[PDB]
Amino acid sequence: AVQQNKPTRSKRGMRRSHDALTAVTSLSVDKTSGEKHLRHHITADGYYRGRKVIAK
Amino acid sequence: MIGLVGKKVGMTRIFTEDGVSIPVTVIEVEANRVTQVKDLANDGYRAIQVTTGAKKANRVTKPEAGHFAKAGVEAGRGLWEFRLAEGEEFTVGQSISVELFADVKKVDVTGTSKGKGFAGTVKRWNFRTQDATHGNSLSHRVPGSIGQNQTPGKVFKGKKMAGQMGNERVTVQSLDVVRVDAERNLLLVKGAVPGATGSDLIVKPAVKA
Amino acid sequence: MIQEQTMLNVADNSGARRVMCIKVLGGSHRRYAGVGDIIKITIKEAIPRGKVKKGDVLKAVVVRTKKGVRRPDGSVIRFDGNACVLLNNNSEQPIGTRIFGPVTRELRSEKFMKIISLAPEVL
Amino acid sequence: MRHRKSGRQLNRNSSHRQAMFRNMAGSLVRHEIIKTTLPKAKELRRVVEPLITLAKTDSVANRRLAFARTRDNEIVAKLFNELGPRFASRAGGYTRILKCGFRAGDNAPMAYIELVDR
Amino acid sequence: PPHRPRPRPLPWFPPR
Amino acid sequence: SNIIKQLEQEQMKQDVPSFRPGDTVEVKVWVVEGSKKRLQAFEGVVIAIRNRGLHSAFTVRKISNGEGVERVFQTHSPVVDSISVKRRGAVRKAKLYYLRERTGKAARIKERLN
RNA sequence: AUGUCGGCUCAUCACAUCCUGGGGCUGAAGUAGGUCCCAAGGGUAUGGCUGUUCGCCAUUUAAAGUGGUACGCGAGCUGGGUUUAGAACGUCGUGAGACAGUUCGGUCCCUAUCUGCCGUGGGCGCUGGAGAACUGAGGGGGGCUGCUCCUAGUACGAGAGGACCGGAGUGGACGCAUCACUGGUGUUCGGGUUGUCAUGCCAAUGGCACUGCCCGGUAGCUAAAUGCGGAAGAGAUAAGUGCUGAAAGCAUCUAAGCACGAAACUUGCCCCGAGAUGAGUUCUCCCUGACUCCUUGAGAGUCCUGAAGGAACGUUGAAGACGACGACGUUGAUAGGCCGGGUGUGUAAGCGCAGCGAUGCGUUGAGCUAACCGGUACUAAUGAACCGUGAGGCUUAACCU
RNA sequence: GUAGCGAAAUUCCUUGUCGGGUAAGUUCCGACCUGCACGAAUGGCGUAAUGAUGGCCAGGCUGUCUCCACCCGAGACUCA
RNA sequence: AAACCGACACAGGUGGUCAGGUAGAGAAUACCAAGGCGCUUGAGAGAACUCGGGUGAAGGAACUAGGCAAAAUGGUGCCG
RNA sequence: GGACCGAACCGACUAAUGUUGAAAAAUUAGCGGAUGACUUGUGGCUGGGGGUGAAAGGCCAAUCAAACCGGGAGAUAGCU
Ligand SMILES: [K+]
Ligand SMILES: [K+]
Ligand SMILES: [K+]
Ligand SMILES: [K+]
Ligand SMILES: [K+]
Ligand SMILES: [K+]
Ligand SMILES: [K+]
Ligand SMILES: [K+]
Ligand SMILES: [K+]
Ligand SMILES: [K+]
Ligand SMILES: [K+]
Ligand SMILES: [K+]
Ligand SMILES: [K+]
Ligand SMILES: [K+]
Ligand SMILES: [K+]
Ligand SMILES: [K+]
Ligand SMILES: [K+]
Ligand SMILES: [K+]
Ligand SMILES: [K+]
Ligand SMILES: [K+]
Ligand SMILES: [K+]
Ligand SMILES: [K+]
Ligand SMILES: [Mg+2]
Ligand SMILES: [Mg+2]
Ligand SMILES: [Mg+2]
Ligand SMILES: [Mg+2]
Ligand SMILES: [Mg+2]
Ligand SMILES: [Mg+2]
Ligand SMILES: [Mg+2]
Ligand SMILES: [Mg+2]
Ligand SMILES: [Mg+2]
Ligand SMILES: [Mg+2]
Ligand SMILES: [Mg+2]
Ligand SMILES: [Mg+2]
Ligand SMILES: [Mg+2]
Ligand SMILES: [Mg+2]
Ligand SMILES: [Mg+2]
Ligand SMILES: [Mg+2]
Ligand SMILES: [Mg+2]
Ligand SMILES: [Mg+2]
Ligand SMILES: [Mg+2]
Ligand SMILES: [Mg+2]
Ligand SMILES: [Mg+2]
Ligand SMILES: [Mg+2]
Ligand SMILES: [Mg+2]
Ligand SMILES: [Mg+2]
Ligand SMILES: [Mg+2]
Ligand SMILES: [Mg+2]
Ligand SMILES: [Mg+2]
Ligand SMILES: [Mg+2]
Ligand SMILES: [Mg+2]
Ligand SMILES: [Mg+2]
Ligand SMILES: [Mg+2]
Ligand SMILES: [Mg+2]
Ligand SMILES: [Mg+2]
Ligand SMILES: [Mg+2]
Ligand SMILES: [Mg+2]
Ligand SMILES: [Mg+2]
Ligand SMILES: [Mg+2]
Ligand SMILES: [Mg+2]
Ligand SMILES: [Mg+2]
Ligand SMILES: [Mg+2]
Ligand SMILES: [Mg+2]
Ligand SMILES: [Mg+2]
Ligand SMILES: [Mg+2]
Ligand SMILES: [Mg+2]
Ligand SMILES: [Mg+2]
Ligand SMILES: [Mg+2]
Ligand SMILES: [Mg+2]
Ligand SMILES: [Mg+2]
Ligand SMILES: [Mg+2]
Ligand SMILES: [Mg+2]
Ligand SMILES: [Mg+2]
Ligand SMILES: [Mg+2]
Ligand SMILES: [Mg+2]
Ligand SMILES: [Mg+2]
Ligand SMILES: [Mg+2]
Ligand SMILES: [Mg+2]
Ligand SMILES: [Mg+2]
Ligand SMILES: [Mg+2]
Ligand SMILES: [Mg+2]
Ligand SMILES: [Mg+2]
Questions:
Q1: Which CATH number characterizes residue C18's domain?
Q2: Helix, strand, coil distribution of chain C in percent, nearest 5
Q3: DSSP chain F
């Protein structure tokens, strides 16, 4: 099964009207390190909810 | 006649002395509290709104809390309306118990059926399967033809096809009331009713009778 | 749970040994016959000098099934085999004079009281 | 439908799943902290925590059960000599899962799972 | 009667 | 679960004797031939037990008038008047369905001597 | 290049009606028919033979309707028949070959753009915002029927036989729900066992051999399991039956007027449903700053403010393709663990005793036990932050000042 | 047109007729002869054994089916 | 065989030699040795439907053009 | 022993899959032959109205009722 007519650039754009990404609503700030992090995830320096939880 | 809101507790059996096992659904019917009364003057129809159960105060939004506050009833887990027959009367704040069903022989029970998700035509519509063997190519449970030819050159509305099954409102009519235990807040009805254990049920006196 | 093509033993002394159900009577598209139901049968195996002959087409009542019968308290009675009693095609009365093996109380009716009375055991 | 069913399949057959969690449970007991995917970490809790529970009550039978479920004498010896005692007065919850980013290769959500007294 | 032969295959040709 | 537990408990018989698969039991059941109630005995080997509170059942097999018969009894049914163990059988398995394909000497169960 | 018979799957309409419903006439006593009128709501066999459609036959059924839909339906299946290439028979032909014929064999492609259809979301709208509960325009589903008993061996009839009307019971087929029971499944639970490899060895275990092969089986899902349904009633009618009644001193169901009258129609039952843009109703909740400029208006901008609520995130669910929907987030049982129970399996391991040994016995209904039940903050569900604003146009009426 | 064979890999009429098998058999087996249009090395008729050969019947067996249910994997679906 | 023949780092093809252990008649087959590898997208999810499998109450060819497919049988010794 | 059962090896009867394939003929499960009119390596010979053919108009480099390449050649085309 295949198109009988070439779809327009208009229709292409309409289909892609739902393809947009969502930015991360809000990042959190660790209360000790001050680093930004995804909520409920550890920071890059291994902090979570103030506590140093992992090395590196 | 008004109904009550209850909760499907589960199924069991009642043995009778004459040696019959009656399959029963156990419906827990706590006090239904009237939250609002609707009348012709203001609303254009007669009905009561009832709540039942409980709700943690922090889960009750301010709009909901204000509604319960006006009635002067504790917040329940939801609101349900029942249309009033011409004879009936109720007041805001009033409790209605399962004693309501004391003399009722048959009830209708409305619930949300269990959710089967996306179901095929075999399960959803009892379509017959095609041959398992004798050369069938990739078409064992598929629906077969879905229309005619150039006339009408379309598929008719309401064609039975795969789709969401269950997780919808279902009423089972004319179930026998086996027992009404006011003290335990229990209604026993004979037979199965819609929904999973724990689900809300609406119980009304049977319309057919 | 007897259907067309099901082979049954015979629980009587009609002379038949094996019979085959060729029709479940009593409704359009009726699928199954259980204990107490009338079926149309053909005789597949018969004793030399019996009241019935191989190839005869008559009726029978199912008296024992492997699927069994449920009772009002939820109990079940299952038998090791399927068995029927041959009936006259018109009168629907037993052909044999003796019943072999147990039968159930599902037969307790004006129609099959002769079978009940002749049966060595009723469950 | 999977109403009320427990257990993740994790795109493996049963024998592979069992082998993997046996290995992973060994890793966690040895290292006390490992990085894995978040669903694997969530499933691992259901394997390791019963092992630690078993190790609280030291007996020949329990050591043999643990061996049957780990197939590593070093792991059994550590369960019964170190971890059992360490968790003697803890009613479950021997592990914690800490979510930590996405894997470069395949964007899998990753987590650390560690013993809580590490 | 039939108005068409039962479908058949074509011989391979260098495609591009 | 307390609600259904309570409903179930109030219907349960308190006088159910202990029995195991492989036991020979006699079950007395009420039979109603019109007005007259009477007890009919069913004696056989217990080949299966379903323990499930009020929903407990047991299956008894016998050979009757040339015919194998199984009856599944609902243990707490009022239809069942009484149960009595006539002989204690020695078997390994919970369910003795393998007896269905056995007859005579082969279907014999050793007695549980204690 | 518009794929062709039949089958399968899935249908949908007509009515010239097969059944069921209503009725007139009968060469209609009754029962049972004949015939014609009205009626399309629902229903409307399984097999043997054959490629068959058909047909014949067997046995059912209330009935096994007739047609239209590309002789409905191959981008849905089949490929038996029939239009390829092989081969043979009869026949025709000197022959190549051929057939008012026959016979054996013989590749069925397509990831769906658009319409359509089944489901399920996102956007914006609905005139301040928000959370709920509704009304119900409108739409869809459903609508089958047997047998027995009572009425009554009554009415009818010389007998034989044998009712209407009305009532009760129990079935078949179909549909909906459900898992208490009976069962299936149950590669996540327990056990038995063959071969082999390993854990130093013994003992005990694990891997692999379709889950190695098996026996049981929890929860869930489920049918063969077991609950429930089709209606009554009402309105307006069909054919039909009438009442009163002239035109036409009579007669006349009809012209005026009035009454009955069917599974059809409109309701009544079930479900969807306010994008019903004709965007409805009810209840509740929230927001009561300052200033500047301009082409002066439903204008723009700055600062302050950020509510109700929402969303995100996290723990998740008998909710689920994803979205969505539901629960819960420490003021906490949302999930996992843990504790207790239940259930399943069937008396673990170790030790002791007996036996030459295989093994048995005792400790012991032992040990282990998934998805179940009841508890329990041990682990994970964060302080925040994000979106959403700051009293809501004009006109006209009425009522208040 | 002999022997032999014959509704046949051949028989149009034709599902011929009779018998057997099935509850029911346009196929099958045994016959009949009315051979449309068999027939003697483009061999006739038989034939043990053999056949991934054609037709038919029976036992066993079964999800082929009545009528499907559940489960395990690989895809489908979501993310990179 | 990713280096040869197959347009490809392609389920294909490619002559000769070597051949351990336990079970086994065996170079079959299962599990292993020496030795060699996990197949150059992954992660989740646990719908329909498709593919490849497992089990199935009662019935047992009723399926179908046709038992197609599946299920079944399956070894050795002795008797027969 | 053109004997039997059965691997290697040689074949290719059935089914499913695949059909913009993993593959311009395969994969999976079954299947036939398997001391012979067997199978296979290396090299050689037969040439296009010619070869070769246990005969299918089969095969002669994925091409066959007359190979492929170049030429006559811009054949001819009352046809599109
Ligand atoms: K039609
Ligand atoms: K109709
Ligand atoms: K056509
Ligand atoms: K088409
Ligand atoms: K297709
Ligand atoms: K279009
Ligand atoms: K169940
Ligand atoms: K179950
Ligand atoms: K082993
Ligand atoms: K609205
Ligand atoms: K918990
Ligand atoms: K136990
Ligand atoms: K002839
Ligand atoms: K001829
Ligand atoms: K010749
Ligand atoms: K000869
Ligand atoms: K052959
Ligand atoms: K290489
Ligand atoms: K998914
Ligand atoms: K050569
Ligand atoms: K040539
Ligand atoms: K060439
Ligand atoms: Mg076009
Ligand atoms: Mg997109
Ligand atoms: Mg669901
Ligand atoms: Mg079918
Ligand atoms: Mg194909
Ligand atoms: Mg298939
Ligand atoms: Mg049109
Ligand atoms: Mg759960
Ligand atoms: Mg994957
Ligand atoms: Mg394995
Ligand atoms: Mg008409
Ligand atoms: Mg109607
Ligand atoms: Mg057509
Ligand atoms: Mg196709
Ligand atoms: Mg088509
Ligand atoms: Mg030819
Ligand atoms: Mg309607
Ligand atoms: Mg409708
Ligand atoms: Mg249950
Ligand atoms: Mg079971
Ligand atoms: Mg099992
Ligand atoms: Mg060793
Ligand atoms: Mg050992
Ligand atoms: Mg190994
Ligand atoms: Mg191996
Ligand atoms: Mg009706
Ligand atoms: Mg127990
Ligand atoms: Mg053990
Ligand atoms: Mg004939
Ligand atoms: Mg004949
Ligand atoms: Mg037959
Ligand atoms: Mg013949
Ligand atoms: Mg000849
Ligand atoms: Mg001659
Ligand atoms: Mg000659
Ligand atoms: Mg010859
Ligand atoms: Mg992608
Ligand atoms: Mg590669
Ligand atoms: Mg290769
Ligand atoms: Mg080779
Ligand atoms: Mg090998
Ligand atoms: Mg090695
Ligand atoms: Mg799957
Ligand atoms: Mg199987
Ligand atoms: Mg079965
Ligand atoms: Mg069975
Ligand atoms: Mg059988
Ligand atoms: Mg048939
Ligand atoms: Mg058929
Ligand atoms: Mg086969
Ligand atoms: Mg097989
Ligand atoms: Mg040979
Ligand atoms: Mg060849
Ligand atoms: Mg092969
Ligand atoms: Mg061989
Ligand atoms: Mg030729
Ligand atoms: Mg070639
Ligand atoms: Mg030429
Ligand atoms: Mg020239
Ligand atoms: Mg030219």
A1: 2.40.150.20
A2: 10, 40, 50
A3: -HHHHHHHHTT--S-PPP--TT-EEEEEEEEEETTEEEEEEEEEEEEEEE--GGG-EEEEEEEETTEEEEEEEETT-TTEEEEEEEE-EE-S-S--GGGGG--GGGG--EE---
- The experimental method, as deposited, was cryo-EM
**CA pseudo-torsion sign D29, D30, D33, D36:** negative
Angstrom distance, B191 CA to G272 C1'? 27
Number of residues in chain E: 16
Given a contact cutoff of 8 angstroms between Cβ atoms, the answer to whether F76 and F58 are in contact is: no
Q: What's the token pair of residue B187?
A: 């209604």
> How many beta carbons lie within 10 A of that of residue B92, not counting itself?
15
Resolution number, Å: 2.0
Cα-trace Rg, chain A: 22
Indicate yes or no: CB of B184 within 8 angstroms of CB of F79: no
d(CA B44, ligand 58 centre) in Å: 101
Q: Are F65 and C121 in contact (CB under 8 A)?
A: yes
Give the CA-trace dihedral at B109, B112, B113, B115, to 10 degrees: -170
Q: How far apart are CA F67 and CA F95, in angstroms?
A: 21
Query: Is the alpha carbon torsion for B107, B25, B126, B171 positive or negative?
Result: positive
Tell me whether chains B and C touch (3+ CB pairs under 8 A): yes
b/e per residue, D52-75, with b = 16+ CB within 10 A?
bbbbbeeeeebbebbeebbebeeb
**Is the C-beta of residue B131 closer than 7 Å to nucleic acid chain J?**
no
Containing domain of residue F32, as a range? 1-114
